[PDB]
Design a binder for this molecule. Structure first.
Ligand SMILES: Nc1ncnc2c1ncn2[C@@H]1O[C@H](COP(=O)(O)OP(=O)(O)OC[C@@H](O)[C@@H](O)C(=O)CO)[C@@H](O)[C@H]1O
Ligand SMILES: Nc1ncnc2c1ncn2[C@@H]1O[C@H](COP(=O)(O)OP(=O)(O)OC[C@@H](O)[C@@H](O)C(=O)CO)[C@@H](O)[C@H]1O
Ligand SMILES: Nc1ncnc2c1ncn2[C@@H]1O[C@H](COP(=O)(O)OP(=O)(O)OC[C@@H](O)[C@@H](O)C(=O)CO)[C@@H](O)[C@H]1O
Ligand SMILES: Nc1ncnc2c1ncn2[C@@H]1O[C@H](COP(=O)(O)OP(=O)(O)OC[C@@H](O)[C@@H](O)C(=O)CO)[C@@H](O)[C@H]1O
Ligand SMILES: Nc1ncnc2c1ncn2[C@@H]1O[C@H](COP(=O)(O)OP(=O)(O)OC[C@@H](O)[C@@H](O)C(=O)CO)[C@@H](O)[C@H]1O
Ligand SMILES: Nc1ncnc2c1ncn2[C@@H]1O[C@H](COP(=O)(O)OP(=O)(O)OC[C@@H](O)[C@@H](O)C(=O)CO)[C@@H](O)[C@H]1O
Ligand code: NA
Ligand code: NA
Ligand code: NA
Ligand SMILES: [Tb+3]
Ligand SMILES: [Tb+3]
Ligand SMILES: [Tb+3]
Ligand SMILES: [Tb+3]
Ligand SMILES: [Tb+3]
Ligand SMILES: [Tb+3]
Ligand SMILES: [Tb+3]
Ligand SMILES: [Tb+3]
Ligand SMILES: [Tb+3]
Ligand SMILES: [Tb+3]
Ligand SMILES: [Tb+3]
Ligand SMILES: [Tb+3]
Ligand SMILES: [Tb+3]
Ligand SMILES: [Tb+3]
Ligand SMILES: [Tb+3]
Ligand SMILES: [Tb+3]
Ligand SMILES: [Tb+3]
Ligand SMILES: [Tb+3]
Ligand SMILES: [Tb+3]
Ligand SMILES: [Tb+3]
Ligand SMILES: [Tb+3]
Ligand SMILES: [Tb+3]
Ligand SMILES: [Tb+3]
Ligand SMILES: [Tb+3]
Ligand SMILES: [Tb+3]
Ligand SMILES: [Tb+3]
Ligand SMILES: [Tb+3]
Ligand SMILES: [Tb+3]
Ligand SMILES: [Tb+3]
Ligand SMILES: [Tb+3]
Ligand SMILES: [Tb+3]
Ligand SMILES: [Tb+3]
Ligand SMILES: [Tb+3]
Ligand SMILES: [Tb+3]
Ligand SMILES: [Tb+3]
Ligand SMILES: [Tb+3]
Ligand SMILES: [Tb+3]
Ligand SMILES: [Tb+3]
Ligand SMILES: [Tb+3]
Ligand SMILES: [Tb+3]
Ligand SMILES: [Tb+3]
Ligand SMILES: [Tb+3]
Ligand SMILES: [Tb+3]
Ligand SMILES: [Tb+3]
Ligand SMILES: [Tb+3]
Ligand SMILES: [Tb+3]
Ligand SMILES: [Tb+3]
Ligand SMILES: [Tb+3]
Ligand SMILES: [Tb+3]
Ligand SMILES: [Tb+3]
Ligand SMILES: [Tb+3]
Ligand SMILES: [Tb+3]
Ligand SMILES: [Tb+3]
Ligand SMILES: [Tb+3]
Ligand SMILES: [Tb+3]
Ligand SMILES: [Tb+3]
Ligand SMILES: [Tb+3]
Ligand SMILES: [Tb+3]
Ligand SMILES: [Tb+3]
Ligand SMILES: [Tb+3]
Lengths: 261, 261, 261, 261, 261, 261
């Protein structure tokens, strides 16, 4: 059975433009602006939106997921350890027990980002891709939002002004580059912020410092995921993501306590 | 609650390599190999796997979704017309009615790919990203599989041999480039296959020729989505995706009839 | 034992220049000039030099080996089927029997090129790397040598004249690109030579046409390895190399009969 | 005589994947991980494997050999001085006496890497090419392994997690870049390691400091070859390789004494 | 002797602009416009200017000389056979007799372009570098000049209009690319001009067809040097330049007869 | 009259290789090695060779001349002031008086490099193009030569060892980059050499400091031309070259006094 389909150019374009502009008018003021659509950023966004907060996750690339897609050296699987596996189970991700290691679970590296993103959207978080955060909005002794630019404009090297998103809290979940905190420190030397970068690999120590390092680095700016270890010179952990998920959830919980919600 | 996490380097690497190995040993022989992880490819894979077939969706880029992510000219929304809207609802995608056009629905362009991919995986389809199909496996008067290469190896220009995936049917769901059918035609001139490419834009005619053009172009090779209009010189339709979803579902139904008769 | 080493700059440079000079004066006239330092080219060179012929193997890249190094899709192993396995054993390559397929042997993809090249050198063949063959030397109704250029000069796009190597026979062992035969055909339209290129993958038919296709395409110019299937529109076979080795050995045997009759 | 060859796609792919995964499962834990497949790295690997140690040589490029291939300024010959010429003789490399200088020997720059690599493989060392070491595994006051990434993934700029290789000792044989020691020093400022880089050319002094500079720079991390002079600000020696070979052999001997084997 | 030098910015800039302006006003109408500052172009320009004609040599690159500089494969020497050696001696170039080949002379590949250019300038020819000829000026059944563009503008890809140079005769001395004749043929299909390109290498036949091929291909457009063999499908000859010099001199003699009859 | 020309491939290649190797054997030991084939380097080479010294000028690009070719902002003329105009007159360069300024002369920017290079060659200096000086040869408290690499090898990024040229004195005439002195200072921090770079433009002061700044910066290493002002933080002078020529001649005179010749 082949259906006669209703299609045109004018109403499709008009519908897309109307929805996109209504969307933009609503996103320019949020409770939390999460920079980076990776495992920790998608987790923080889900747990904040889950509680009724107005949240936007900003991802530079056209698609979200960060460094999960490729797994380990291209082998498409990632490891999660207890109790962080419960966060992936909550997103409907299929997990298998690693035989020689109690507490280790393995998941398809392509299934994880897709389901974590879908779960954040279902919790009420807005995910905007192809949007690069190039700077922050400042106020006296605090961060008050982010400065966004189109990824294509940035990549094409065009000299164009950005637009802004006002937020009560900003989360730097940009990975080992800690690009948001690094930009804040580089452009505002008077603040005395230093981003030493991650140390070499030591999974045991790297995973067990992420939660301690997930905190407010400057008023209004939180750091989570690998960016937390990059800002506090913590070790790397490899293709094990338990700490990334727990770091994102802790970040949400810390901001919820500050907003009393 | 303080979390003492179990983490190391050796067992994480071993677990990833073992799972990836077991996966590769299973995926080298499938019932259907779908080339392209776009809207039509993800739909065809879901409806084929839903019926118990062994299916693999091969996507060149690190993430799937194809041309959905960006919406229309960067505006992050896409249109779907009835009855294709039901396919998106089956994947749990949130749809809004377009004001003034009965039959039109609009969806967040970032939510669609994430949920379509998650739905295909839940139906039992395997999605492999970062894998480029560079050629086909031939037999007397038929296609019998695909020749795959790592996307990074291809992009880096390294001279490396590929590996193969045997399949009863191959689906070219690579979009307007119809790369699979074009490669078959270019390397095997004796077959007399021609890929004229898509015509200019005419949404009404473009959308209503996709189902008619979704067919077996060469024994063992089916074409669906925008690749069907590229192979049969059909018009383009823009950011309206109803035909892409229905074309993928029709493709699955056509292959299911062949394999169950 | 403490080592007091004799070292300077002048005598090291002088020794290198003298040896390179003496080498170039000898290599400008050879019996056979093999273009391509891949599996078939290295085999043809070994079996020709083994019989006392003056042979030179010209490779574009800094190192030889061609497409063997990477194995299959980066997995560092390659397959060889009997009786071609004997050619690899003659070079001292370690082979393992494939479980479940009688006649199949597997070898480390890094060990093969190193040992095939060392075996060709020990047989008396000269291997020159970083040398690109950009054209052929012609005579009435025959090829009489090759036109060589430095790979760095070619890559840098510098406008520099090449030098030449006179040869009784030239072997195009450049792989699927069949660059030597393609250049001959493109620059000399009057000869009526056509290079259709390889067909799609079909290992069974592809491997069993290589020997038939290993022949003299134009007087003085032989084709072997994957270039033979590219010139005669044969199928591809993937990471199985038995035919490549046997094609190189057959090429050497065919030229030896011509030069000893 | 043309043989009917047994060939297919499925069993070739399956055999390659099985061998590659059995290989990867074995390489993730070694006695020594040598970074760099150049003259000193290939020598150190040969002399360690020769004594029964489990060794892996990791090379970034598709082929090993480092800076030997090109000889001096493209002239394809390299010089070796006594007693280092015995190391090349042990690999079966053909040497000629330099006439004006007693103690100097010259060799074909293409024959050296091929035979040094074949000799290391025959001694029992595993050589993995197309593998970039991007970081180290650390423990309290020591290096405990390497962090590896696919060269194509690294070159393609893909954001993908690496995998690891546990080792009792790591050898930085990456040449004048001393990339392993430089990464350790750059990412772990708390260790106080400095990599000044090589000084200008002075063959006499450069060659006679290599052995003194071949040592353990940090517990578990040895440096050899030009990397030894780069880490200790030693002079360059040019296309004379005696010190590179003796440095690699000394490195092996020093590690064998520490492992008591 | 201490030197007190007179220097400023204003008068230096003013002097350069005034001279360049006066120069451009004079060069926009010439008797002959030679395209290409290579061996044949520099020779044709010298012999035309020597007879009192107003001549301009237009070279795309910042410096003239073409493919002489690099000699053969980077070896900085070029061969000239009698009687063309006399043309180089007339320019003051030092020549050495080739041992064992009577009639062959060898010259420093860096000395040749410098002296040929200086000789053309001393004969009265104007050489303009960094000027690309992108098209021709046409009239009924004839070429009447050239369309010039700045090489930097062309290289930078800027969309800028060119300027023109009116000439009684134009010489295509652009080498094997025969860019001027190829542009004329490509943009004016109605003229029926074909540029097959050079054939493979055959020095004996290639050198002995250059003079025969040095002729008027279209009224007002002459072809000389390697461009003459490219337009008439002649063979290549390598690093022997006798024919290039004699072809340039013949071209000048042919144009002089036309302009004095 | 068209002559029957003697031409072949073998003897042309043999003649070029023989001359190039005889040349290389002679150039590896010189009295002075001049780095940079610009106005000051070509002048210094001419005046040193004029006195019977064995001199080699090494230029990175395929052609010499440096920044003279383009004149001022592409306007093809350069200014020379008294008494430096006599140096250009000695090379046979045609000069015109600048009308408003007594002491200023203007010359064709294309005629200058060609004639300065031809004059240096006629004085007995050897000019090698396409040769990059990447480092220096050191001895106790002195520079003893240069480390050379092929420009194409350097540009192509190939990992290849260089060769050397022993010299009593080295001249850094590389322009405002002062690449030779900068490399010496960067690689040998123990020497305490600093290269601040040129200051902004001030022709009067820039031209009148060049001679004072033309001196021996480190034993065996002289600096001349703009490199002299770059090493001593002198001002720029623009398209006026009087100081460049006088600086090169002074450099020659200073070295002749040290060599007592
Ligand atoms: N300035 C920016 N604006 C917007 N997005 C940005 C910006 N900078 C980075 N991003 C984007 O943020 C995302 C961060 O995802 P990413 O996956 O890098 O960070 P993560 O959530 O902490 O997880 C890190 C692990 O993948 C890995 O490091 C590991 O060791 C395993 O545990 C990536 O997808 C970037 O494209
Ligand atoms: N050789 C290949 N191997 C693997 N993947 C491939 C190959 N060639 C293409 N792909 C991948 O296939 C996917 C194709 O997805 P794509 O979204 O382009 O195709 P589609 O499912 O038919 O939908 C088309 C619409 O987006 C759009 O065209 C439209 O409606 C306007 O008229 C993209 O994600 C490619 O990266
Ligand atoms: N013009 C040239 N001059 C010099 N070298 C050249 C030129 N063109 C190519 N080469 C060099 O020639 C070598 C060819 O080696 P290559 O390995 O590609 O050819 P082969 O010996 O027939 O073996 C082919 C298989 O690897 C593979 O195709 C297969 O089995 C799948 O069907 C490569 O190393 C090139 O760099
Ligand atoms: N991070 C990395 N991971 C893996 N491989 C690497 C990495 N960094 C470098 N390599 C690879 O390591 C290899 C080092 O080989 P290389 O030849 O550079 O080092 P070497 O053994 O000390 O010998 C140095 C001489 O060639 C030369 O400098 C000289 O003066 C003559 O004596 C090269 O082939 C690199 O590609
Ligand atoms: N459209 C253009 N406008 C201006 N200059 C141009 C244009 N196209 C080419 N040129 C310039 O013209 C010059 C041509 O010099 P070229 O040296 O290439 O031509 P030639 O004078 O005939 O001598 C050819 C030999 O070098 C060589 O081919 C040989 O003997 C082997 O068979 C080169 O310097 C180009 O940059
Ligand atoms: N490492 C190197 N090896 C070889 N050649 C080199 C190297 N570095 C630079 N060169 C080459 O050296 C040449 C230097 O020529 P350059 O013209 O730059 O130096 P110069 O003789 O002092 O004259 C400077 C003026 O052109 C200009 O600055 C000015 O203000 C007017 O007076 C240039 O042609 C480079 O390509
Ligand atoms: Na298969
Ligand atoms: Na004009
Ligand atoms: Na020759
Ligand atoms: Tb119908
Ligand atoms: Tb508000
Ligand atoms: Tb709600
Ligand atoms: Tb527990
Ligand atoms: Tb345990
Ligand atoms: Tb328990
Ligand atoms: Tb507040
Ligand atoms: Tb980064
Ligand atoms: Tb940094
Ligand atoms: Tb602790
Ligand atoms: Tb609390
Ligand atoms: Tb089966
Ligand atoms: Tb459903
Ligand atoms: Tb309507
Ligand atoms: Tb309605
Ligand atoms: Tb379930
Ligand atoms: Tb069937
Ligand atoms: Tb495309
Ligand atoms: Tb119709
Ligand atoms: Tb039906
Ligand atoms: Tb002969
Ligand atoms: Tb044998
Ligand atoms: Tb069977
Ligand atoms: Tb058996
Ligand atoms: Tb022997
Ligand atoms: Tb014959
Ligand atoms: Tb190719
Ligand atoms: Tb048949
Ligand atoms: Tb026979
Ligand atoms: Tb037969
Ligand atoms: Tb163990
Ligand atoms: Tb053993
Ligand atoms: Tb001794
Ligand atoms: Tb001595
Ligand atoms: Tb002795
Ligand atoms: Tb211990
Ligand atoms: Tb480097
Ligand atoms: Tb550095
Ligand atoms: Tb000492
Ligand atoms: Tb001891
Ligand atoms: Tb007029
Ligand atoms: Tb004369
Ligand atoms: Tb003769
Ligand atoms: Tb004679
Ligand atoms: Tb005069
Ligand atoms: Tb007329
Ligand atoms: Tb060209
Ligand atoms: Tb004839
Ligand atoms: Tb006549
Ligand atoms: Tb005649
Ligand atoms: Tb001496
Ligand atoms: Tb003299
Ligand atoms: Tb005066
Ligand atoms: Tb004044
Ligand atoms: Tb006066
Ligand atoms: Tb002295
Ligand atoms: Tb510079
Ligand atoms: Tb600087
Ligand atoms: Tb003063
Ligand atoms: Tb004095």
């Amino acid at each position: 059975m082949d259906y006669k389909l209703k299609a045109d150019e004018y109403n499709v374009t008009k519908a897309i433009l109307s929805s996109a502009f209504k969307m933009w008018m609503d996103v320019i003021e949020v409770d939390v602006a999460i920079v980076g659509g990776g495992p920790s950023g998608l987790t923080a966004g889900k747990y904040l939106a889950k509680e009724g907060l107005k949240v936007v996750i900003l991802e530079r690339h056209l698609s979200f997921g960060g460094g999960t897609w490729g797994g380990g050296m291209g082998f498409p699987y990632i490891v999660v350890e207890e109790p962080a596996d419960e966060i992936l189970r909550d997103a409907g991700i299929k997990l298998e027990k690693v035989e020689d290691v109690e507490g280790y679970y393995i998941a398809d590296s392509v299934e994880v980002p897709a389901k974590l993103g879908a779960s954040a959207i279902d919790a009420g978080a807005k995910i905007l891709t192809s949007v690069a955060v190039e700077d922050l909005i400042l106020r006296e002794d605090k961060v008050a939002g982010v400065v966004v630019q189109g990824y294509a404009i940035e990549k094409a090297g065009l000299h164009v002004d950005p637009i802004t998103i006002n937020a009560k809290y900003v989360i730097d979940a940009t990975g080992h580059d800690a690009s948001v905190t690094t930009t804040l420190a580089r452009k505002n030397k008077d603040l005395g912020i230093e981003v030493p970068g991650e140390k070499s690999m030591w999974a045991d120590k790297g995973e067990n410092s992420l939660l301690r390092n997930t905190r407010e680095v400057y008023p209004g700016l939180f750091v989570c995921g690998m960016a937390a270890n990059a800002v506090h010179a913590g070790y790397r952990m490899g293709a094990i993501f338990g700490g990334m998920y727990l770091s994102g959830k802790k970040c949400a919980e810390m901001i919820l306590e500050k907003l009393n919600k």
